[PDB]
Amino acid sequence: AAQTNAPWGLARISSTSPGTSTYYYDESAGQGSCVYVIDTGIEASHPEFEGRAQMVKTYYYSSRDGNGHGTHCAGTVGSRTYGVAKKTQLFGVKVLDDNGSGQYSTIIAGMDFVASDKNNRNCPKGVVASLSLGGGYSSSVNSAAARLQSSGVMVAVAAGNNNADARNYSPASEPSVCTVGASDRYDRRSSFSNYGSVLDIFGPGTDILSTWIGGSTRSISGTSMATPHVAGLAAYLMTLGKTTAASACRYIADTANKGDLSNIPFGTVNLLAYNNYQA
Ligand SMILES: c1cc(CNc2ccc3c(c2)OCCO3)ccn1
Secondary structure (H helix, E strand, O other): OEEOOOOHHHHHHOOOOOOOOOEEOOOOOOOOEEEEEEEOOOOOOOHHHOOOEEEEEEOOOOOOOOOOHHHHHHHHHHOOOOOOOOOOEEEEEEOOOOOOOOOHHHHHHHHHHHHHHHHHOOOOOEEEEEEOOOEEOOHHHHHHHHHHHHOOEEEEEEOOOOOOEHHHEEOOOOOOOEEEEEEOOOOEEOOOOOEOOOOOEEEEOOOEEEEEOOOEEEEEOOHHHHHHHHHHHHHHHHHOOOOOOOOHHHHHHHOOEEOOOEOOOOOOOOEEOOOOOOO
16 A cells, blocks of 8 residues: 555554655555553544544543644554554553653553453454653663563654663663664654664654644654654554564564664664665
């Protein structure tokens, strides 16, 4: 399948070169997979989700996304126009308030929630969790992300936006999950992207168009935007049968575009997520 005039990040993940604008992908499109978006919520009524999104848990007075951040990330995973895996099922877990903030204890509870809740959902092709959040190093936060991964969920986490070594942030620094840095449309490391040995992969993170609350759209930047590209890619590849939740991060690194990004610090992987789809 070909989506013309796609957001640059979608075109990038199906291309061996920057500077194109069509997204190419197998029509299975993540059907039969599920992606949890652990964030500020999801505006499931947005036409772009086509009834495939729902809120499953909140720790606050509403499950609605009063911020936009979670809706944007969910849109990059699986919206019809802005998403990588256009037929996946999206499940929202609201661990962040409408200002985008949340306590680590709540974030930990949300991760353990997903590890159990997947047993209440139909995801025959596999389960992914996208975590576009983080803070300073916490062994307990890292352990929760490790548990979620161990339970059979492909965990993708944002590296962080401090232009710093991600070893000092959580869940970014957890070795067993997939830690995602951000790149721009010219294949440069995004100016804010964290780096370091703990990163596993880069995805598009600068000027990313996706869904927003109020049935709208907007373009924003962050490792929060790169993470759902990788989460959606994992769901798409699991639906194709090419990998599993336990192996998807390594498979994405194995099949990535290699050595094509600029301003990657010595010691950080130079790997850009790529779907290797041959039309
Ligand atoms: C790991 C990941 C994160 C999430 N990073 C992030 C999220 C949203 C953002 C952002 C940066 O930068 C600008 C505003 O939007 C924060 C801390 N550690």
